[PDB]
Design an enzyme around this catalytic site. Sequence first.
Site, short mmCIF file in Angstrom:
data_model
loop_
_atom_site.label_atom_id
_atom_site.label_comp_id
_atom_site.label_asym_id
_atom_site.label_seq_id
_atom_site.Cartn_x
_atom_site.Cartn_y
_atom_site.Cartn_z
N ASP A 140 0.83 -1.32 -0.10
CA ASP A 140 0.08 0.03 -0.14
C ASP A 140 0.98 1.29 0.07
O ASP A 140 0.53 2.32 0.37
CB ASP A 140 -0.93 -0.14 1.20
CG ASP A 140 -2.10 1.11 1.11
OD1 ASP A 140 -2.04 2.14 0.74
OD2 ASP A 140 -3.27 0.49 1.58
N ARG A 144 0.93 9.61 0.37
CA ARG A 144 0.24 9.86 1.78
C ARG A 144 0.47 8.83 2.75
O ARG A 144 -0.37 8.83 3.50
CB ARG A 144 -1.23 9.97 1.38
CG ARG A 144 -1.77 9.01 0.64
CD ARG A 144 -2.26 7.57 0.95
NE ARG A 144 -2.10 6.95 -0.24
CZ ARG A 144 -2.59 5.64 -0.42
NH1 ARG A 144 -3.05 4.84 0.71
NH2 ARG A 144 -2.55 5.16 -1.78
N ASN A 145 1.60 7.96 2.66
CA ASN A 145 1.72 7.07 3.80
C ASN A 145 3.20 7.09 4.33
O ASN A 145 3.76 6.16 5.11
CB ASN A 145 1.21 5.76 3.31
CG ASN A 145 0.00 5.51 3.67
OD1 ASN A 145 -0.44 6.37 4.69
ND2 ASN A 145 -0.82 4.47 3.24
N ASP A 158 1.59 3.33 6.82
CA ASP A 158 0.22 2.44 6.90
C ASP A 158 0.36 1.44 6.59
O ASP A 158 1.29 0.83 5.57
CB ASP A 158 -0.63 3.25 5.79
CG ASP A 158 -2.22 2.99 6.29
OD1 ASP A 158 -3.05 3.57 5.97
OD2 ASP A 158 -2.13 1.85 7.02
C1 LIG Z 1 -1.43 13.85 5.83
C2 LIG Z 1 -2.02 13.66 7.10
C3 LIG Z 1 -1.61 12.75 7.79
O1 LIG Z 1 -1.69 11.53 7.76
N1 LIG Z 1 -0.97 13.36 8.69
C4 LIG Z 1 -0.26 12.54 9.68
C5 LIG Z 1 0.61 13.18 10.66
C6 LIG Z 1 1.07 12.56 11.74
C7 LIG Z 1 1.01 11.07 11.65
N2 LIG Z 1 1.43 10.25 12.78
C8 LIG Z 1 1.14 9.15 12.93
N3 LIG Z 1 0.23 8.56 12.24
C9 LIG Z 1 -0.09 9.00 11.24
N4 LIG Z 1 -1.25 8.41 10.24
C10 LIG Z 1 -1.71 7.45 10.54
C11 LIG Z 1 -2.26 6.47 9.59
C12 LIG Z 1 -2.87 5.50 9.98
C13 LIG Z 1 -2.59 4.76 11.41
C14 LIG Z 1 -1.74 5.78 12.50
BR1 LIG Z 1 -2.16 5.06 14.10
C15 LIG Z 1 -1.65 6.87 12.13
C16 LIG Z 1 0.07 10.34 10.81
C17 LIG Z 1 -0.50 11.22 9.74
#
Ligand SMILES: *CCC(=O)Nc1ccc2ncnc(Nc3cccc(Br)c3)c2c1
Lengths: 281, 291
Positions: A140, A144-145, A158
Amino acid sequence: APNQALLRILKETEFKKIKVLGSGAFGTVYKGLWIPEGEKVKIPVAIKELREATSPKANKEILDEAYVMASVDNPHVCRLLGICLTSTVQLIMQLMPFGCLLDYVREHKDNIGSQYLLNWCVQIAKGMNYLEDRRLVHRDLAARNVLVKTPQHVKITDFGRAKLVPIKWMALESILHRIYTHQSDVWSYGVTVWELMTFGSKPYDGIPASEISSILEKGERLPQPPICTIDVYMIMVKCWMIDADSRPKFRELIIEFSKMARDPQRYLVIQGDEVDADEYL
Amino acid sequence: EAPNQALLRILKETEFKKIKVLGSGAFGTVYKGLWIPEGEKVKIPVAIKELREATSPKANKEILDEAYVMASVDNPHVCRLLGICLTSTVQLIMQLMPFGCLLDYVREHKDNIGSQYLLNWCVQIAKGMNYLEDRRLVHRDLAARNVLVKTPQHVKITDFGRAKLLVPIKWMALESILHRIYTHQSDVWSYGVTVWELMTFGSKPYDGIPASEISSILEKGERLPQPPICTIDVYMIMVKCWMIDADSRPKFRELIIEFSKMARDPQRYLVIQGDERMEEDMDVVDADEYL
Ligand SMILES: *CCC(=O)Nc1ccc2ncnc(Nc3cccc(Br)c3)c2c1
Ligand SMILES: *CCC(=O)Nc1ccc2ncnc(Nc3cccc(Br)c3)c2c1
């Protein structure tokens, strides 16, 4: 050997959801605040509540993902902090301040330098190599990941499959036969890179998703980003070979960009070129 | 150590079709076809190469390095690669040259070719080969059926299958036949035969001679004979290129110069005695109009 990486279980009341981060077909994300009980500290986080449907087969499955985000220690992969036990499991993780690697490049695109772009490619290749070295298929992978801890540090995050549909970012083996190998990830990598070199262009824009499988037989692919020299765009194309064996291995990709990273202006042409959870411990 | 900003357009197959076959190398083949950008009411004349049929991966990582190169050189004397295609077995696109192989052009308009025209081609080719020797590269394959005609006034080299850096036996140096050793000086041997080709308007070099006695012939000290329309001043440069000692051969930089002298005064070096020169719709813009 022993694989002693702690899984820490938090109660929901300890933290609240602030604003929504993104939506996936099954499950969504939030950016929130974790507040350990009575500790006068608000830790910035990211929470993923499950796709609401909750039937059991899926729960034995959502948990295997938590096992994994929890079991890898590498500078290039996010590392899972906590998990929650709602009826529909939620997952917690340090929030990365500068957002998706995809967003960061759109907001400070007039300022991104050639040195900065290659460093990210070499870093990601390492993050993906760590997993291919650990025998694991992300399946995946795409802009955006990947995340931004600091403009100097990025991390893949992700795992929606993390199997041990995003068609535009999938290899040909994938679209037609649902066959993911480590080399099927390389195809994604190739598009992820094209993503940085356009500061956020939608790959295959306006092309109906169903005609995609046919386009690739026809021999067409993504075009050459402007700021790309042919030396760089060639590596993007090699990753898109219909023959999975003709594609570069994530080990070799680290090396190829490390060469260009030594001399960024020779491969990238830019006009005008020139409380923390982690803290918690 | 300057950056390489050469473009490489990737085209989809449906955009163009093959019309008539052009030539053949056992693995791979040419085509002359029509490229039709999607819905742009234009039919561009092209040349397409569907590489040799098997796609053993080993070969794909190799076929692409060739595409990198046709793509990375800008010189008035070397064809320049237009696009490529991603069939499973890689294919290559390129601006078609209307007057065909330099080898064909001379056969069809041989009663009209003038002394001034022949030397200009020799000097041009020498430049095309010098450009490559100047960028460290061995064609390994150079001969008449591999130079093209943009206009009777402009020619360009174009086939690289070999493309190596550092089998057509009749056109190969002695080092090549026995030891597969290509140097820039081993192209020089080919050049020498390529020129002999023009001076006969298309004679088959070493005609009737079985390919295997060729390595022995060369030690016996025989070589190609003197085309009639050649003066001895010209045939001598052909022989010097055939010296068994690679170091005795003329360098492509020097060849440019030597012919430039004769090109000043063509009738002093070539004797023709006919000396003097000079339903299918068009939807069709050749390589330049479309960026
Ligand atoms: C572009 C928006 C975004 O996804 N921002 C962002 C900032 C910091 C992060 N830190 C930790 N995780 C994620 N995304 C995320 C996606 C799926 C599962 C998990 Br627990 C965290 C971001 C995303
Ligand atoms: C004498 C027959 C022939 O080769 N004619 C011809 C005309 C114009 C050309 N323009 C571009 N390419 C080629 N040949 C060719 C050979 C190998 C690879 C490529 Br993409 C093109 C010709 C050939």
